Ligand binder design. Structure first.
Ligand code: HEC
Length: 103
């Protein structure tokens, strides 16, 4: 996807609850550094819901694309209160930025 477009999407819709940098602080949600290739709910020091911790899947392009379309549907009981990015293209650009900014 388009990393530059994804960044603006992140700043507009995710930044209020997330940081991406290495050593980043947990805000409402967990810092996202090292997200790709890691199982759900593994950010150090963040108190996840049992649901986010128990999902058991590995975060990558396919799982993130599905999750971000409708967070609560993918992880029922999650405390991430966000409706989701409905447009596929916008979601792909965001994933591209996420992959570039979290490693
Ligand atoms: C606050 C109002 C939030 C907004 C806006 C977004 N997210 Fe979030 N996210 C938030 C919380 C409180 C949590 C933990 C939920 C739980 O049940 O424990 C999360 C979690 C995620 C995750 C999973 C991280 C992991 O499993 O380690 C991801 C991938 C994530 N959030 C991504 C994300 C993106 C890209 C957002 C913008 C589109 C976004 N979140 C917004 C709270 C909030």
């Amino acid at each position: 996807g388009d990393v530059a477009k994804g960044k603006k999407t992140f700043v507009q819709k995710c930044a209020q609850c997330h940081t991406v940098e290495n050593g980043g602080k947990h805000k409402v949600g967990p810092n996202l550094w090292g997200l790709f290739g890691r199982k759900t709910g593994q950010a150090e020091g963040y108190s996840y819901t049992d649901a986010n911790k128990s999902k058991g899947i590995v975060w990558n392009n396919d799982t993130l694309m599905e999750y971000l379309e409708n967070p609560k549907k993918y992880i029922p009981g999650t405390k991430m209160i966000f409706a989701g990015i409905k447009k596929k293209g916008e979601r792909q650009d965001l994933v591209a930025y996420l992959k570039s900014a979290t490693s």
